Design a protein around this ligand. Structure first.
Ligand SMILES: *[C@@H]1O[C@H](CO)[C@@H](O[C@@H]2O[C@H](CO)[C@@H](O[C@H]3O[C@H](CO[C@H]4O[C@H](CO)[C@@H](O)[C@H](O)[C@@H]4O)[C@@H](O)[C@H](O[C@H]4O[C@H](CO)[C@@H](O)[C@H](O)[C@@H]4O)[C@@H]3O)[C@H](O)[C@H]2NC(C)=O)[C@H](O)[C@H]1NC(C)=O
Ligand SMILES: *[C@@H]1O[C@H](CO)[C@@H](O)[C@H](O)[C@H]1NC(C)=O
Ligand SMILES: *[C@@H]1O[C@H](CO)[C@@H](O)[C@H](O)[C@H]1NC(C)=O
Ligand SMILES: *[C@@H]1O[C@H](CO)[C@@H](O)[C@H](O)[C@H]1NC(C)=O
Lengths: 389, 146, 49
């Protein structure tokens, strides 16, 4: 048996394609081999290359894929294109997967989509638990673009409950012009910084702060990104700095590291950039989310054997006859992947339960110092250091 | 047009441009206006937006105008009013998260002056303002902006 | 008190050790201070003389 998926990827001109497409093709190859699941059915796909930051081209490619006939469209990363693809697949009833966080409209009435990216409400309360553990009074939150203010909503609302002083600054459009901003932060004399940006932006900010001579024993940085292992701590390890972040890729598991070395040769197929200050040979988190997304789609479609793909039409409003049952089978599968266990909130379809672990910069590198959970709060080995009778 | 349906707005815009018009005065909701703006920017037809929507910082569309006042200038006017009134502690109360996009200069203004900020969000329904007003009275501050 | 090559080496090691603050003041007895790279330390607020 055969089954086709819908892949939409915002491509880059020249070089290799995006790492999400590499993870998608590698994951399809590892489902087409290694017969743990899907014995009677093989999986094919169809990838399209759409324009960066456009939604009409995304709608055209989604209608081309739906006229071709797919099982589930794997949506893009940009917010407006994901909104358009969410609208068309909601109107046609085809299930949708998001590997990237988008701004959720509160009064939107859609139910034909899931997003395996962790919710920033739970991430924001994880940051709140970490800043409550460190006993801070004045903190400065630095973001890059305005939508991050949506992503740190509970951090903004948290001075209404505690005695936490909080200042907020925005990084400029030019990535190398942080020197006035870091000069102002050095003049203001704050030593408690929460950065909210991508890992490449965080690497550029950290390098320009090293050129600023900022980080010491006094300063302390908390990064909201989940790609802290992509950075190199070689020019920052011996300076006594307490960079702290969150992780979701449980590299302690052996099969996870097997996936790491299975993706390492395709990573080094693309040339690295040593000037960027990024450690090559490591998974970005969205590739792991795409891997776990198509794996949980695979274990959901394994339970449904009568999956027939119909070439639906955008110009008509005839929904798929299997879309409701397939979505109501997707929305509860407890597949164990590279991001820990995967569960979906049944109210909205957003991933709100996960097992992060907090990492910190030690003198030997980045080490795991604890574990965050939504129900269990924040248990860590440092708090359980002194436990006498 | 239906409530919050970007594909329906896309289909109506396609049918209307197949009928042929000069310019389109699009919807009042942000996602459908974004889809209609992208479609008419791809097809060259001008767009006129009445209500403010969130602008993506790196969208290269140039076939659209907006007639709501820009919320950066509104935030600067609000900050001018607050700095005229000589205040220290304020409570920003919003309902939709895009208001945090709208009043971003007011949140950045503690880096400028010695302004104390308390920011609260109204609940999902409309009749449950009373617990927020009870928390407002119990928090013992008076300068409230909505 | 060293050569300018050892001065560049000890300056890179001091940058890696977080010595490049406003507190630290450095005096070099070598006469080749323009031979050193002025770029990665001139924004750190150090006092090199
Ligand atoms: C599916 O999505 C739902 C989204 O609506 C999830 O509901 C949300 O659940 C979280 C986690 O339980 C809630 O988080 C926290 O807030 C409560 C306090 O709210 C209390 O005050 C509110 C006042 O308006 C009420 O609305 C609440 O119902 C309740 O009256 C805290 O008690 C929680 O605390 C954890 O954190 C604090 C420190 O901050 C500790 O004191 C606690 O002991 C514990 O350590 C949370 O902070 C959230 O309120 C809730 N609702 C939303 C977002 O609207 C739902 O859980 C989710 N389900 C699954 C399965 O994923
Ligand atoms: C920073 O790290 C040191 C050693 O790792 C630790 O003793 C200290 O408590 C940390 N925090 C601060 C604020 O210095
Ligand atoms: C997590 O919490 C449990 C008890 O709640 C504790 O036994 C365990 O040691 C904690 N994990 C770590 C890494 O400290
Ligand atoms: C460093 O030089 C500045 C002048 O630029 C001076 O104000 C400051 O006191 C000096 N600091 C030390 C530690 O010598």
């Amino acid at each position: 048996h055969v089954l086709r998926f819908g892949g939409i990827f915002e491509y880059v001109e020249s070089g290799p394609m995006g790492a999400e497409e590499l993870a998608f093709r590698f994951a399809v190859n590892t489902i087409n081999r290694n017969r743990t699941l899907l014995p009677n059915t093989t999986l094919t796909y169809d990838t399209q290359k759409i324009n960066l930051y456009d939604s009409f081209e995304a709608s055209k490619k989604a209608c081309d894929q739906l006229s071709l006939g797919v099982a589930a469209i794997f949506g893009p990363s940009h917010s407006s294109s994901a909104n358009a693809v969410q609208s068309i697949c909601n109107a046609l009833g085809v299930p949708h997967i998001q590997t990237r966080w988008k701004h959720q409209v509160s009064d939107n009435k859609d139910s034909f989509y899931v997003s395996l990216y962790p919710d920033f409400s739970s991430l924001s309360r994880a940051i709140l638990d970490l800043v409550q553990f460190f006993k801070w009074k004045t903190v400065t939150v630095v973001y890059d673009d305005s939508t991050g203010l949506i992503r740190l909503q509970e951090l903004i609302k948290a001075p209404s409950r505690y005695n936490l002083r909080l200042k907020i600054r925005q990084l400029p459009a030019d990535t190398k012009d942080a020197k006035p901003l870091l000069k102002e932060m050095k003049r203001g004399k704050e030593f408690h910084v929460i950065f909210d940006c991508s890992h490449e932006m965080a690497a550029g900010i950290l390098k320009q702060a090293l050129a600023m001579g900022m980080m010491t024993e006094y300063y302390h940085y908390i990064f909201t990104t989940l790609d802290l292992f992509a950075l190199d701590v070689e020019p920052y390890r011996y300076s006594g700095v307490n960079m702290t972040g969150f992780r979701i890729l449980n590299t302690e598991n052996t099969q996870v590291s097997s996936i790491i070395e299975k993706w390492s040769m395709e990573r080094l197929q693309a040339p690295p950039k040593p000037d960027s200050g990024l450690l090559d040979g490591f998974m970005t988190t969205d590739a792991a989310l795409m891997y776990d997304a198509v794996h949980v789609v695979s274990v959901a479609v394994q339970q449904f054997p009568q999956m027939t793909v119909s070439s639906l039409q955008c110009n008509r409003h005839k929904p798929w006859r299997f879309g409701t049952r397939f979505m109501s089978l997707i929305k509860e599968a407890h597949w164990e992947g590279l991001t820990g266990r995967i569960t979906f909130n049944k109210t909205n379809g957003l991933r709100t339960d996960f097992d992060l672990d907090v990492i910190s910069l030690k003198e030997e590198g980045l080490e795991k110092i604890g574990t965050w959970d939504p129900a269990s709060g924040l248990n860590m080995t440092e708090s359980q250091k002194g436990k006498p009778a």
